[PDB]
Structure formats: structure tokens, C-alpha cells
């Protein structure tokens, strides 16, 4: 079997990107943000505590013929801006873009974070990392890609991020219209349930590459590219006028700069991330200082492929017995 989605951006920044899955007879559609950082499928739904829901879309487990509660099951996550949810736990069946997974763990949110609510546009979560960082307790749960593995055409999913503009995720197959050149392969550790991998050095704009191990995961669910501090301020500095601002919180810079490209090498082949990938606008509206889309992982403890370097490629999640990712230009 296979599956084919579109992926759009929830706004013009291209914050987050938001995929309609189907849950539940009859169907429910939800917008969930496909997140290879984490492994929890979980939903608004009319168990989330009222105040807390502001818009979103949710499921309503009582009205789906074949969910079904999951007795005793509970999760909780918290993620890397801070953000956290909670709830219980249903199986159902789950659809995406025609690929369908029986008994899948349907994660049902009783409270979200504020900033989970203060976002109308994301119905939720689909957690593509391994299923080693699934939070169900007391039995964990698999992700939907580990469920529909099995019974897919190939162990894989692509994701082809768009700038400014709608994308796909696939799974099952590979899309060879769908990039320019050769896929480059390259190893993945699972060791701490992450696509985590390890970069062959960068270049900022047309200046030489730099020819040094950087290892860091290839995170869906974030939006910016989060690099240690000695590359970040290598890339910034050929910016007239940008600095780290602690009061904002990262690098910025004037709006009216023209910002150089970022190159990040996967084995001996080059990914160029274009510098208006690398805009994220004002920092607050009407103000001529705008927000860099480099930031520095230093406060992170792990460096992160986030969107930004992401959606300047087509990336294969190759999930054989041996995981591997891809990295293609397009």
C-alpha cells in the first residue's frame, strides 16, 4: 500500500505545516502537524478542558464506531519549546492520504499547553520519530508509521516541505519526479529515538565549505535550523547590522538586509538552503528588526534540522531494519 498528502503552511512564515487526517467511522478530519521529533499521535477533542480550546477542530471518540478506550492508558509530553499536553488514550482507525492503519493509538488531549491553543490551525500531532519515545503508560504505543510499515510497498515516508507554499508527505514510495539529481544516503542513529545523523560540514553563501562533523535530527515539528554557536555566528556575521539579542531571544537583523544562502553537506553532496528561507520577519509587527531562521543550539543540547534546512530538500525517513535517511535537491 501507499499514501500521498498535501502538507500547507499555517501561515505566511511557514511556521508549522498542517496535513488533514482522517480518524474514526465516519471519518473525522483533522489538520495534525506531522512531527519527526516526537512520537505521539494526540488530538484536540471533546475531552480537552473547554477553555483551552480555541478553534481547533476536534474528535469526538463517542461518535466513531470503532474507537475503541485503551483502559488504563495515559500520556503526557512535553516538548522542546516548552510547550505539553496530557490525556487519555483511544485506539481507532487513521487515515492518511489513502494509506489506512487499523487500531491505531489516538492520543486524546484533556489539557494542552497555552501555546497549543493560541493556534487555531493544528488539530493536533502525528509523531513520525521512533516509537522507543512514545509516552503511553503503562504500555507504550507504536507510531502510525511504525503500524503501516508492515503493509507498505516500502518501509519509508518522504517529506517535501514547500517554501511558502504547499507540500507533500508520501508514504510507501518514493516520488522520483518529485526531486533533481541523486538521493544521497546517509547514517542514522537511533539511540536516543530521533533521525539523528550527522552532517559533513556547511558553507555560508558563496564562501568555502567548511569540512566538519555537525550531528543533529531531522525535525519536521521545528520550524527553525538550530546549529552550534560558532556556525551560527559564522552565517551572521555576513549580515550588516545582525546580532544575538537576549531580549529577543536569538539572532536578528535589519529587514532590509538581503540575507546570503546556508550549504549544509550530506556525505559529499550539498544542500543549499536560499537566504529568503532564512527570513522569518519582524519581530513584533511594524518593527524593521526581523527574525533570524538561524539560531544557535546551544541551549538545546542537540542540533536541529528543522524546516528551514528541511524544505530545501526532499528527505527520505527510510525505516528498513536498518534506518538510513535521504537527502535530495529539488
Given at each position: 500500500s501507499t499514501g500521498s498528502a498535501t502538507t500547507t503552511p499555517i501561515d505566511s512564515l511557514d511556521d508549522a505545516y498542517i496535513t488533514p487526517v482522517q480518524i474514526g467511522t465516519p471519518a473525522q478530519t483533522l489538520n495534525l502537524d506531522?512531527?519527526?521529533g516526537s512520537s505521539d499521535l494526540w488530538v484536540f477533542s471533546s475531552e480537552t478542558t473547554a477553555s483551552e480550546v480555541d478553534g481547533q477542530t476536534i474528535y469526538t471518540?463517542?461518535?466513531?464506531?470503532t474507537a475503541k478506550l485503551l483502559s488504563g492508558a495515559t500520556w503526557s509530553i512535553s516538548y522542546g519549546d516548552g510547550s505539553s499536553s496530557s490525556g487519555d488514550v483511544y485506539t481507532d482507525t487513521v487515515s492518511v492520504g489513502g494509506l489506512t492503519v487499523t487500531g491505531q493509538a489516538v492520543e486524546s488531549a484533556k489539557k494542552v499547553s497555552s501555546s497549543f491553543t493560541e493556534?487555531?490551525?493544528?488539530?493536533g500531532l502525528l509523531g513520525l520519530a521512533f516509537?522507543?519515545?512514545?509516552?503511553?503508560?503503562?504500555t507504550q504505543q507504536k507510531t502510525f508509521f511504525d503500524n503501516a510499515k508492515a503493509s507498505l510497498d516500502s518501509p519509508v515516508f518522504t517529506a517535501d516541505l514547500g517554501y511558502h507554499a504547499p507540500g507533500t508527505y508520501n508514504f510507501?514510495?518514493?516520488?522520483?519526479?518529485?526531486?533533481?539529481?541523486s538521493i544521497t544516503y546517509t547514517a542514522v542513529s537511533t539511540k536516543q529515538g530521533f533521525w539523528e545523523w550527522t552532517s559533513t560540514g556547511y558553507a555560508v553563501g558563496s564562501g568555502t565549505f567548511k569540512s566538519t562533523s555537525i550531528d543533529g535530527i531531522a525535525d519536521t515539528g521545528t520550524t527553525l535550523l538550530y546549529l552550534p554557536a560558532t556556525v551560527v555566528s559564522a552565517y551572521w556575521?555576513?549580515?550588516?547590522?545582525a546580532k544575538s539579542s537576549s531580549s529577543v531571544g536569538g539572532y536578528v537583523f535589519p529587514c532590509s538586509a538581503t540575507l546570503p544562502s546556508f550549504t549544509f553537506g550530506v556525505g559529499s553532496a550539498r544542500i543549499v538552503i536560499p537566504g529568503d528561507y532564512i527570513d522569518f520577519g519582524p519581530?513584533?509587527?511594524?518593527?524593521?528588526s526581523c527574525f533570524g531562521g538561524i539560531q544557535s543550539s546551544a541551549g538545546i543540547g542537540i542540533n536541529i534540522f528543522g524546516d528551514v534546512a528541511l524544505k530545501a530538500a526532499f528527505v527520505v525517513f527510510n525505516g528498513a531494519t536498518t534506518p538510513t535517511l535521504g537527502f535530495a535537491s529539488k
Amino acid at each position: 500500500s501507499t499514501g500521498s498528502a498535501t502538507t500547507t503552511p499555517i501561515d505566511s512564515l511557514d511556521d508549522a505545516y498542517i496535513t488533514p487526517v482522517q480518524i474514526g467511522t465516519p471519518a473525522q478530519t483533522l489538520n495534525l502537524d506531522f512531527d519527526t521529533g516526537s512520537s505521539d499521535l494526540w488530538v484536540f477533542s471533546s475531552e480537552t478542558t473547554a477553555s483551552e480550546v480555541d478553534g481547533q477542530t476536534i474528535y469526538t471518540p463517542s461518535k466513531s464506531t470503532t474507537a475503541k478506550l485503551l483502559s488504563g492508558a495515559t500520556w503526557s509530553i512535553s516538548y522542546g519549546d516548552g510547550s505539553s499536553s496530557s490525556g487519555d488514550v483511544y485506539t481507532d482507525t487513521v487515515s492518511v492520504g489513502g494509506l489506512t492503519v487499523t487500531g491505531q493509538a489516538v492520543e486524546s488531549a484533556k489539557k494542552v499547553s497555552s501555546s497549543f491553543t493560541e493556534d487555531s490551525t493544528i488539530d493536533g500531532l502525528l509523531g513520525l520519530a521512533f516509537s522507543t519515545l512514545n509516552t503511553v503508560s503503562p504500555t507504550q504505543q507504536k507510531t502510525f508509521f511504525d503500524n503501516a510499515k508492515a503493509s507498505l510497498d516500502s518501509p519509508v515516508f518522504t517529506a517535501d516541505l514547500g517554501y511558502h507554499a504547499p507540500g507533500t508527505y508520501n508514504f510507501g514510495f518514493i516520488d522520483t519526479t518529485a526531486y533533481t539529481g541523486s538521493i544521497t544516503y546517509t547514517a542514522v542513529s537511533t539511540k536516543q529515538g530521533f533521525w539523528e545523523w550527522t552532517s559533513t560540514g556547511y558553507a555560508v553563501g558563496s564562501g568555502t565549505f567548511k569540512s566538519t562533523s555537525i550531528d543533529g535530527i531531522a525535525d519536521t515539528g521545528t520550524t527553525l535550523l538550530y546549529l552550534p554557536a560558532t556556525v551560527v555566528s559564522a552565517y551572521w556575521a555576513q549580515v550588516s547590522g545582525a546580532k544575538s539579542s537576549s531580549s529577543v531571544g536569538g539572532y536578528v537583523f535589519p529587514c532590509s538586509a538581503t540575507l546570503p544562502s546556508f550549504t549544509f553537506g550530506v556525505g559529499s553532496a550539498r544542500i543549499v538552503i536560499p537566504g529568503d528561507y532564512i527570513d522569518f520577519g519582524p519581530i513584533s509587527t511594524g518593527s524593521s528588526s526581523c527574525f533570524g531562521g538561524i539560531q544557535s543550539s546551544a541551549g538545546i543540547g542537540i542540533n536541529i534540522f528543522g524546516d528551514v534546512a528541511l524544505k530545501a530538500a526532499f528527505v527520505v525517513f527510510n525505516g528498513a531494519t536498518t534506518p538510513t535517511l535521504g537527502f535530495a535537491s529539488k
